[PDB]
Design a protein around this ligand. Structure first.
Ligand SMILES: [Mn+2]
Ligand SMILES: [Mn+2]
Ligand SMILES: [Mn+2]
Ligand code: NA
Ligand code: NA
Length: 320
DNA sequence: CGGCAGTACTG
DNA sequence: CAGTAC
DNA sequence: GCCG
């Protein structure tokens, strides 16, 4: 990063807008920040600033104030509420609206939340694991978790295929959670397995709390046996083999990579989701789908890139 | 002016 | 539905 | 916030 002295200050305003609910402005900051993190050289002119995609007038002005002054004065007017809003929205299941409501109602600390707030089932689990869910795990531990889920899955059906996606598959040395994708090449045997799979993972004490228990998605909490172990977030998705390539693409990410590809598909009258790549999609004035189009055959990730006119990228080059 | 990705789950 | 999360 |  040739522009840390700039990016460091912008990230503060980005987080501030984000926890206060100004999501599009925060999105603009996030994009500019990675634009800057990716410039080869330091930014040293206003007109150089505008040269970068994702940096416009208002952002170039801020970068200019920063180098001429070493400071950004907007930093000195950020609401006193922002650190508390960040504290509260780091509870899993509590976002900006819940955080702002708790703040309005007088709560200022997690002790206040614990003793006085009315929590959803999910948020009570989030609070109980507050510290652990802010911690990443070593890659090696993600492997043991993936293998734990796969052994329990293949006990029921040896044909089941399980793959850890997310940051693990992008090759990162540490992982925020473990994202396990499960399918079956027979196109049928994936059905109805969650019941038994999850009950198998509880019987041993591995699965400790459930956050979401859907027909296709499980989100929850696990902990490997023995001393020195933290609770870890675990996500499991079960998909039909027909959708494996698009599900793998989605669940490998990164988030900004997915958003970028899906935005590209839209420009081409196509639609990309965790289910399928579709073409001939009909949309209205506002970019919203009004006609579904046709699913395109995508047996592999490479096919999705190809049909979008893009060169293939291995997972590690998707870490955007 | 207005989109900024597309979807699943919860109550 | 709004809210939240992936 | 940026950009078409
Ligand atoms: Mn993940
Ligand atoms: Mn996850
Ligand atoms: Mn713990
Ligand atoms: Na630009
Ligand atoms: Na949260």
């Amino acid at each position: 990063n040739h522009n840390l002295h700039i990016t460091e200050k912008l990230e503060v305003l980005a987080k501030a807008y984000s926890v206060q609910g100004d999501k599009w402005r925060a999105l603009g900051y996030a994009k500019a920040i990675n634009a800057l993190k990716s410039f080869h050289k330091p930014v040293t002119s206003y007109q150089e600033a505008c040269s970068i995609p994702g940096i416009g007038k208002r952002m170039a002005e801020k970068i200019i104030e920063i180098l001429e002054s070493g400071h950004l004065r907007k930093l000195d007017h950020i609401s006193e509420s922002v650190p508390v809003l960040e504290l509260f929205s780091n509870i899993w299941g509590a976002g900006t609206k819940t955080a702002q409501m708790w703040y309005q109602q007088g709560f200022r600390s997690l002790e206040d939340i614990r003793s006085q707030a009315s929590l959803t089932t999910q948020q009570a689990i989030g609070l109980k694991h507050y510290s652990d869910f802010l911690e990443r795990m070593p890659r090696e531990e993600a492997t043991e978790i993936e293998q734990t889920v796969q052994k329990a899955a293949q006990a029921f059906n040896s044909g089941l295929l399980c793959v850890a996606c997310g940051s693990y598959r992008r090759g990162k040395a540490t992982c925020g959670d473990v994202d396990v994708l499960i399918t079956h090449p027979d196109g049928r045997s994936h059905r109805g397995i969650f019941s038994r799979l999850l009950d198998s993972l509880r019987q041993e004490g591995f699965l400790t709390d459930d956050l979401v228990k859907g027909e296709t998605k499980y989100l929850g909490v696990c902990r490997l046996p023995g001393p020195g172990r933290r609770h870890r977030r675990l996500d499991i998705i079960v998909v039909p083999y027909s959708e494996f390539a698009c599900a793998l693409l989605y669940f490998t990410g990164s988030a900004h990579f997915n958003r970028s590809m899906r935005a590209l598909a839209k420009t081409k009258g196509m639609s990309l989701s965790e289910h399928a790549l579709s073409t001939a999609v009909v949309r209205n004035t506002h970019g919203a789908k009004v006609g579904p189009g046709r699913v395109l055959p995508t047996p592999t990730e490479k096919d999705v890139f190809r049909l979008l006119g893009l060169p293939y990228r291995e997972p590690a080059e998707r870490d955007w």
